[PDB]
Write a protein that binds this ligand. Structure first.
Ligand SMILES: Nc1ncnc2c1ncn2[C@@H]1O[C@H](COP(=O)(O)OP(=O)(O)OP(=O)(O)O)[C@@H](O)[C@H]1O
Lengths: 403, 96, 103, 204, 116
């Protein structure tokens, strides 16, 4: 059942690669790898990417959870294979995750790219929602994945995704980063990434930062500077932001304790109601500046819409198995707000139940853990796409063995 | 705000199923079995306490319980309980 | 009572009328709810075997993660105990000098 | 002298009341459940190098029937369904273990017109029943209990009506719930009691 | 820490040695209960319960029933020589005494042909 394999979870934010059967991925690095057109050189290591040099324009090999640069994809695959894996691809089957909305053309091109270039013994392309359901202990249920690019509610019934029930919303990590940018700009906060700081001195709360700029600066692009700024913004998110328990109330938002945070340049200040007004857009995009439009569906709205487009015979099961995953889901009180909104919306007959997985490893790596336990099953041995299957049936075999 | 009450229904149904896989037990029969368990518990405990007190001892030990079982259970019923208890103590101290 | 009972009784007739109105609205009792479902199950189902093995292995993986974290906690607390007991053993070597005097 | 020599408690209770040579190796193996002969590897023992793969038994495929072109053209002809429209249904059934809740989604709506779940299932079961009725010797469950698609349709519709009930059909619906008992008690306790009391007054 | 093992599992008993020792230590039966007293008590309780349950199941199977009832417990307790000696003072709710057979009526007297 357990054979030496490599489960690849290529997320839009981070790519997780490891051996099937492990509790955690072997490596986890940001997906927005820096690129320099020298062929082009790519850096697939946190210590080799977030470095004060080497312009490294961020190419983001994938976008919207789908492959968009096959050359950069080959480069990142090669680096992951001989940097942390350090093994011949021909000796290990490959189980790779895919976005449910991934087109067949991509699927097939990726499949053939792993048989004529890497010559892997077997292949399999499973959807992220299926893997998530597989990990959390449910074959039927709704997968709520609030990633960096999009927040999606993917209904899984009997291990298969119901495309008609897929609902997507652009309110994701990118939206949170944009809101944090706007908040910093409104509070006259200079977002100085670490690579620009030579040294700093402790200053009083709210006072201007006293930091020295490095004289021998790197030759960075606007893209790489924005990438460093977005990393700092994501740190700020993980450190400060918190979802409101109930619908955002300005009066109640001003009664919550503040959270202290110091930027890399030394600037530090306490945040009050501004840290709880940003995460409200995820659930209620109406009260969002610059987002003038009601078509955007909130997390609870996305869930209810995804469940509504499915057959009523399975909606009870979907509500009874609503798996929450993604990095954005790690924000404080997000789960409580989501459960409250769903209980208020979910009809009484439908027994709402939220799986109690909330750990960072359990959340961000749910998709990878799913494939890890799926490739370790003896029953899964009969579903592999063997090299002979690809050589005979061609690239289109991906559509039959792993629909 | 719950007022939970305990019982041996968990170790008696288990014993029943291990000795009688196919035969069940009703709720009232379970209560009667629990009452018997508690009554024998009280009897053995009181006998061991009194036996220890006779010897000017402030501790009830396995020997006191063994002699109390010898005294209470009649004829060819004590021996079996004593043997079971001794074999459980020997298997308990052996760290198995 | 037993006088001017119309004020109380006409309410029941109004409630009957509202009951008919609601039956027209969505329905009081859904007509013929789940009368027949003859779909015969598969002999076993490959997917049902896969789901059984999936449950078996997922429960195992979860328990194994929990047990691994518990064992890590155990070993860390054990090394902390080793250091604390080394210092307590220095103190007890002093107490053993005292006990040797005593002996 | 006391023999003892054993544990204190057990002793008192008893007396007071008188080379491995099995190497694991990385072995290749072929799974009988596969027809392509794909060679996989497994961590097996040395005592069973060459034994068949045990999990192959968990490969019972669904019993989707297969029929010839002539049989189709003769018996399974349908004005509303063409071969290109019918073969895809059975292909999806064979591919997804004959579950219609997933087959509907997989339906290629580009080349094929939109079909519900109930009508797809009805067409499938009708094709199966015809294949059985045109077969005598193989005993293909001639009397298949084909479900009534119309009853299934109205059931799907009434329960869907019972689904969306937010404004007043779930909260104010408690009124109709209480009425379910009031009308079953008040109506009787009024009219039948009126009859009974009239008969009593007649006897009185 | 190490995986905690209960005391019922070590000895190999089903009844709770833990709860037994608990009732004992704060039951005022003594000042400092021994470590082996509760194990032995639970073992004897388990043996007696197993015996009475065996007898009750036998009586139920003889009566063609699946669920044990006070009838079966009473029958088992009063049939066994030693359990009755142990539970002579005890009375059971919804129980009954051992019955007599009515077949004796047939070959002595029955309804005659008079106006039958
Ligand atoms: N500790 C944290 N606290 C709060 N938010 C976080 C934390 N860590 C990451 N995030 C947010 O989560 C986002 C990353 O999402 P994640 O990587 O889980 O999606 P994903 O699994 O890659 O989705 P997909 O598989 O569809 O690509 C980031 O944009 C970041 O803002």
């Amino acid at each position: 059942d357990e054979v030496g394999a490599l489960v690849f979870d290529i997320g839009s934010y981070t790519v997780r690669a490891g051996y099937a059967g492990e509790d955690c991925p072997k490596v986890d690095f940001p997906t927005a790898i820096g690129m320099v057109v020298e062929g082009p050189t790519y850096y697939i290591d946190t210590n080799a990417l977030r470095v004060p040099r080497e312009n490294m324009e961020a190419i983001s090999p994938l976008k919207n959870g789908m492959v968009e640069d096959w050359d950069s994809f080959q480069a990142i695959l090669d680096h992951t294979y001989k940097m942390h894996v350090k093994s011949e691809a021909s000796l290990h089957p490959v189980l790779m995750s895919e976005a449910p909305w991934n087109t067949r053309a991509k699927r097939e091109k990726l499949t053939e790219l792993m048989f004529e270039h890497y010559n892997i013994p077997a292949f399999f392309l499973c959807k992220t929602a299926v893997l998530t359901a597989f990990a959390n202990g449910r074959s039927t249920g709704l997968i709520l994945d609030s990633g960096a690019t999009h927040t999606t509610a993917i209904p899984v019934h009997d291990g298969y995704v119901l495309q008609q029930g897929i609902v997507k919303s652009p309110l994701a990590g990118d939206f949170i980063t944009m809101q944090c940018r706007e908040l910093f700009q409104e509070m006259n906060i200079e977002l100085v990434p670490p690579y620009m700081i030579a040294s700093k001195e402790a200053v009083r709360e709210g006072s201007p930062a006293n930091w020295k700029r490095k004289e021998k600066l790197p030759q960075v692009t606007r893209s790489w500077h924005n990438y460093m700024c977005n990393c700092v913004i994501q740190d700020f998110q993980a450190s400060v932001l918190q979802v409101s328990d109930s619908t955002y109330d300005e009066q109640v938002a001003a009664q919550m304790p503040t959270v202290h945070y110091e930027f890399p340049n030394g600037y530090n200040c306490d945040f009050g109601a501004e840290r709880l007004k940003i995460p409200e857009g995820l659930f209620d995009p109406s009260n969002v500046k610059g987002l003038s439009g009601n078509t955007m569906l909130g997390v609870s709205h996305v869930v209810t819409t995804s469940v509504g487009m499915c057959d009523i015979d399975i909606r009870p099961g979907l509500y009874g198995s609503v798996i929450v995953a993604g990095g954005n889901t790690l924000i404080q009180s997000f789960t409580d707000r989501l459960n409250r909104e769903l209980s208020q919306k979910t009809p009484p007959s439908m027994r709402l139940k939220l799986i109690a997985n909330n750990t960072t490893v359990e959340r961000r790596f749910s998709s990878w853990i799913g494939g890890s336990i799926l490739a370790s099953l003896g029953t899964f041995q009969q579903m592999w796409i063997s090299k002979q299957e690809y050589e005979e049936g061609g690239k289109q075999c991906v559509e039959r063995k792993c629909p | 705000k719950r007022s939970r009450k305990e019982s041996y229904s968990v170790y008696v149904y288990k014993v029943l199923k291990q000795v009688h896989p196919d035969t069940g037990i009703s709720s009232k029969a379970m209560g009667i079995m629990n009452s018997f368990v508690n009554d024998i518990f009280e009897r053995i405990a009181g006998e061991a306490s009194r036996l220890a007190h006779y010897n000017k001892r402030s501790t009830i030990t396995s020997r006191e319980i063994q002699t109390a079982v010898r005294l209470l259970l009649p004829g060819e019923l004590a021996k079996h309980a004593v043997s079971e208890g001794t074999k459980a103590v020997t298997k308990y101290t052996s760290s198995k | 009572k037993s006088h001017a009972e119309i004020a109380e009784q006409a309410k029941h007739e109004a409630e009957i009328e509202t009951r008919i109105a609601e039956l027209r609205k969505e329905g009081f009792w859904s007509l013929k709810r789940l009368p027949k479902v003859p779909e015969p199950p598969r002999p076993k189902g490959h997917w049902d075997y896969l789901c059984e093995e999936m449950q078996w292995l997922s429960a195992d993986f979860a328990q194994e993660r929990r047990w691994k974290r518990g064992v890590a906690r155990k070993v860390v607390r054990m090394v902390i105990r080793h250091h604390e007991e080394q210092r307590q053993k220095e103190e007890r070597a002093r107490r053993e000098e005292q006990a040797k005097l005593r002996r | 002298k006391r023999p003892e020599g054993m544990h204190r408690e057990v002793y008192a209770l008893l007396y007071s009341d008188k080379k491995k040579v099995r190497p694991w190796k990385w072995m290749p193996f072929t799974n009988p459940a596969r027809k392509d002969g794909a060679m996989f590897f497994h961590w097996r023992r040395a005592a069973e190098e060459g034994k068949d793969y045990p999990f192959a038994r968990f490969n019972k495929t669904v019993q989707v029937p297969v029929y010839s072109e002539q049989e189709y053209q003769l018996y399974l002809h349908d004005d509303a369904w063409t071969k290109a429209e019918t073969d895809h249904l059975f292909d999806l059934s064979r591919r997804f273990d004959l579950r219609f809740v997933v087959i509907h989604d997989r339906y290629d709506h580009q080349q094929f017109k939109k079909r519900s779940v109930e009508d797809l299932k009805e067409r499938y079961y009708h094709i199966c029943a015809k294949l059985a009725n045109v077969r005598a010797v193989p005993g293909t469950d001639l009397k298949i209990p084909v479900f009534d698609a119309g009853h299934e349709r109205r059931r799907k519709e009434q329960l869907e009506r019972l689904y969306n009930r937010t404004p007043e059909q779930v909260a104010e619906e408690e009124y109709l719930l209480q009425e379910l008992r009031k009308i079953e008690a008040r109506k009787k306790e009024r009219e039948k009691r009126s009859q009974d009391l009239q008969k009593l007054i007649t006897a009185a | 820490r190490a995986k905690a093992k209960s005391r019922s599992s070590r000895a190999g008993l089903q009844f709770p040695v833990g709860r037994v020792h608990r009732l004992l230590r704060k039951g005022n039966y003594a000042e400092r209960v021994g470590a082996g007293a509760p194990v032995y008590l639970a073992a004897v309780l388990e043996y007696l319960t197993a015996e009475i349950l065996e007898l009750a199941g036998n009586a139920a199977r003889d009566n063609k029933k699946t669920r044990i009832i006070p009838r079966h417990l009473q029958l088992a307790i009063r049939n066994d020589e030693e359990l009755n000696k142990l539970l002579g003072r005890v009375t059971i709710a919804q129980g009954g005494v051992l019955p007599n057979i009515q077949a004796v009526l047939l070959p002595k007297k029955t309804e005659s042909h008079h106006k039958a």
